[PDB]
Structures are given as structure tokens and as C-alpha cells.
């Protein structure tokens with residue numbers, strides 16, 4: 001397949017639903033390359049667990065942990081890593097309030113080249129156990145011969161864009177990785193990088209990040225089709241931020257407007273949002289504890305009940321993952337009969353202004369609070385007009401895109417409620433016999 005989009009392994013599904021899936025031990029295996037050094041960008045780390053996922057022969061190679069923790073949380077992470085002399089830490093600066101470091105990425109330097117992994121899982125056991133998570137695996141990027149002067153750039157500008165993302169940290173440990181990337185040939189890359197970094201961007205920088213970055217890519221590298229107004233937008237996420245008192249504040253005014261862009265020309269486009277119901281969580285493989293990773297608070301939700309009429313259940317029969325709660329986040333543009341898609345994005349970014357950005361200063365400035373990272377699949381980058389949707393995710397022309405959940409999405413029933421993690425659920429027990437009492 002050309003897309004190299006994978007799901008993580010799920011404990012408890014039949015082997016046919018894990019055949020093409022990846023565990024972190026598979027990604028770090030010597031079959032993928034002979035490791036020299038690695039950088040782990042993430043949010044939450046269990047360092048003891050993380051080191052055990054590297055093959056024994058590679059467990060003393062240098063590891064850089066890139067995180068956003070401050071104060072006591074920072075001290076706790078340093079204490080976790082102190083027993084391992086080969087682990088260094090890089091604290092991503094977070095100068096805007098309520099921002100976090102959500103980017104999930106591995107940089108893997110081998111004897112044989114370089115690989116980039118952009119994914120959705122925290123580096124803790126539970127995120128790789130029974131959740132639906134997404135992985136994009138780069139090709140093995142060869143080193144450019146010393147003395148050869150090549151760009152090593154792809155038609156999607158991935159090399160320059162990844163360097164630009166890392167430069168935004170202003171961090172000495174990442175300048176080392178920038179120099180590594182400069183020395184490798186990334187020309188085979190067929191995805192576009194979509195990142196968020198904290199800041200206030202105007203003018204020439206407005207299109208670099210967040211939902212304006214997506215809009216720019218869709219204007220430049222996708223084509224509008226007739227009846228484009230009939231092609232829905234689908235967003236699928238594991239958390240929701242405060243979006244405002246009604247849909248016109250942000251969701252349907254600037255977010256949806258960026259997502260409905262196609263081509264360079266001058267809305268009743270349906271918007272489907274997929275987010276687990278309480279029943280989805282109760283009957284999941286993990287039971288109610290799965291909701292520990294779906295952190296929608298009652299304080300936020302009670303301020304935006306208008307939002308929940310957009311919500312659709314989690315269903316993933318196509319990949320055997322209906323009971324594996326989603327921590328992947330995806331956004332896409334299906335055709336009116338959901339048989340084709342105009343593009344697909346997998347990312348760390350949840351449905352929030354912090355992650356995607358919000359316009360400020362009379363619409364002249366995009367303010368982003370957090371670090372996020374994802375990759376965009378555009379048909380034009382594969383020589384196509386659209387992607388056909390793969391009917392079964394793990395089944396057998398390889399130019400069909402593996403969408404990991406069912407289409408069309410199913411609207412919440414009248415008795416369904418969105419999972420809200422900080423209220424009790426004591427009416428019916430979960431798959432382990434327990435209630436939820438936060």
C-alpha cells in the first residue's frame with residue numbers, strides 16, 4: 001500500500017483484526033532499522049515501560065524525551081528518567097496559558113537512514129492496549145552522501161515543513177535533530193505535514209499552522225468538484241474544548257470554513273462529529289476506565305449543549321474496533337454517499353481552539369496555544385482525483401484508503417449522551433462489573 005497508515009494492535013480482537021496492525025515493539029524492532037538514537041515527542045510518559053519497548057540490544061542508545069511538563073510534573077518526569085543515563089529531556093516552551101505539548105512523534109536515526117513516525121498514542125501501556133490509535137510510518141530515508149548537494153525535498157515540502165516545525169521549539173537538543181534531517185533524503189514523502197505550535201501568527205505566518213495551514217493546503221492542492229456543497233465534513237476526536245455559546249462563534253464560522261475549502265475559487269455542508277457515547281464507553285473492552293482518556297468535563301459540556309446535536313457514535317466494524325475506544329483523531333471529506341473521500345487527516349489535534357487556533361485582532365491574527373502534529377493525505381499527491389474508501393480496513397487496487405471506522409456515521413439516539421468524564425454513571429455496570437464514580 002502507498003499510504004502507510006496503520007492502527008495499533010488491540011488486545012482481545014481476533015487475529016484477523018491485528019494482522020496489519022502495529023505495536024510499539026514492532027515499530028522499534030531491528031527489522032525496521034539498526035537504531036543509533038531516537039527522539040520521543042509526547043504528552044504522557046511511563047519511562048520504565050517505554051525503555052522496555054525498545055529491543056534489548058537498543059536500550060542504551062540515546063533517547064530524547066520532548067515534553068511540555070512544568071513545575072512538579074517536570075520534576076516527576078526527571079525522576080522517572082534519572083535511572084537511565086542515556087535519556088535526555090527537552091522541555092517544550094509553553095508561553096501561552098492553557099497550552100500543552102500534544103504532538104506524538106518518533107524520530108528514529110538508524111545506521112541505514114532515518115524514519116519519522118507520527119502517531120496518536122501516549123507512551124504508556126494503556127494507550128497501546130485496547131484503544132483505537134493511528135500511526136503514519138515514513139519510508140526509510142537514506143542519508144545524502146557527504147559532498148553531494150541535493151535538497152532531499154519531496155513534492156509535498158515535508159522536509160522543509162518538518163524542519164520548520166522543529167525550529168519553532170527554539171531548543172538546542174532539537175537543533176541536533178534538525179541537522180540530522182538536513183543530512184537525509186526525504187523526497188519519497190507523499191503526505192503533507194500539518195502542525196500547530198504556540199503563538200500569535202499574522203501576515204506571512206498566518207498560513208503556517210493550525211486550521212489556516214489546512215485551508216492553505218486544500219486551496220493549493222485539492223480541486224473543487226461539482227456539488228461540493230453536498231460533500232460532508234467528518235471530524236472524529238477524543239476530547240472537546242470550549243467552543244462558545246453557539247456554532248457561529250468558532251465551529252461553523254472559522255473551523256468548518258477551513259475544512260470545507262477546496263481549490264482556489266471564491267454553508268449547508270453537513271458536519272458529522274464522531275465522539276463516544278456513554279454506552280460506547282460502558283460496553284468497551286476497557287469499560288468505564290476508557291473514559292479516563294476522553295476528558296470532556298461537565299463544566300465545559302454544560303456551556304455548549306448545542307454541540308451535542310452534531311455527535312455520532314463510535315462504530316468501527318470495518319476494523320473490528322467498535323469496542324476499542326478511540327484515541328486517534330481524524331478529519332476527512334467524504335462524498336455524499338461516503339464511497340470516496342477528497343482527503344484524510346490523522347493528527348493529535350482534538351476539537352478545540354487551543355489545538356487548531358482561533359482568530360484574534362479583527363481576524364488578522366491566529367492564536368494557537370498548543371503543539372500538535374498530523375499528516376494529510378491528498379489524492380493529488382498520489383496522482384488521483386479522489387480516494388476510494390476501503391470497504392474492510394484489513395482486507396485486500398491498493399489505491400483505496402483505509403478509513404478505520406464505519407461510514408456513514410450513526411447519530412446519537414435520543415437516550416444517548418456524550419461521554420463526560422467527571423460525573424458518575426451508576427445505572428448500569430461496565431464489561432468488568434464496575435460503575436464510574438469520579
Ligand SMILES: O=C(O)c1cnc2c(C(=O)O)cccc2c1O
Pocket residue numbers: 043102121122292293294295
Ligand atoms: O493524548 C493527549 O494529548 C491527552 C491529553 N490530555 C489528557 C487528559 C487531560 O488533559 O487531563 C486526560 C486524559 C487523557 C489525555 C490525553 O490523552
